[PDB]
Write a protein that binds this ligand. Structure first.
Ligand code: HTZ
Ligand code: CL
Ligand code: CL
Ligand code: CL
Length: 94
């Protein structure tokens, strides 16, 4: 869904995305997009934000993730939509 070149893009999360990443063990100040997505997956999984049955549906209206993304819920199958939301929360480095 997302070209490898884009997944490999180097980025610097803005402070609130950063603090969220670090809350699930992230150790750096910059990341590839692939790494950002990896840690956001850890966040969603460990906080159990996904629907019990249709586990690709994420509910975030009672979480800081909803504030960061600007939505109450989303589907994890929509990778471009997710990337678009994440780019509003970081600065591209390279
Ligand atoms: C409850 N289960 C269904 C969870 C299973 C979790 N998976 C083992 C991990 C494997 C790597 N994963 C993630 O990196 C991974 N990272 C994410 C970051 C965001 Cl913002 C949203 C979803 C994911 C996510 C993921 C999920 C997922 C994650 C948690 C709960 C429910 C489902 N299911 C497929 N993926 C893969 C995926 C979805 C969207 C996008 Cl843009 C990028 C990628 C990366 O391929 C999911
Ligand atoms: Cl990815
Ligand atoms: Cl990588
Ligand atoms: Cl998927």
């Amino acid at each position: 869904q997302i070209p490898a070149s884009e997944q490999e893009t180097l980025v610097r999360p803005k402070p609130l995305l950063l603090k969220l990443l670090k809350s699930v063990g992230a150790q750096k100040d910059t990341y590839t997009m692939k790494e950002v997505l990896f840690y956001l997956g850890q966040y969603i999984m460990t906080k159990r934000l996904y629907d019990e049955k249709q586990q690709h549906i994420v509910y975030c209206s009672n979480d800081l993730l909803g504030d960061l993304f600007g939505v109450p819920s989303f589907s994890v199958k929509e990778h471009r939509k997710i990337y678009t939301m994440i780019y509003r929360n970081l600065v591209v480095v390279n």
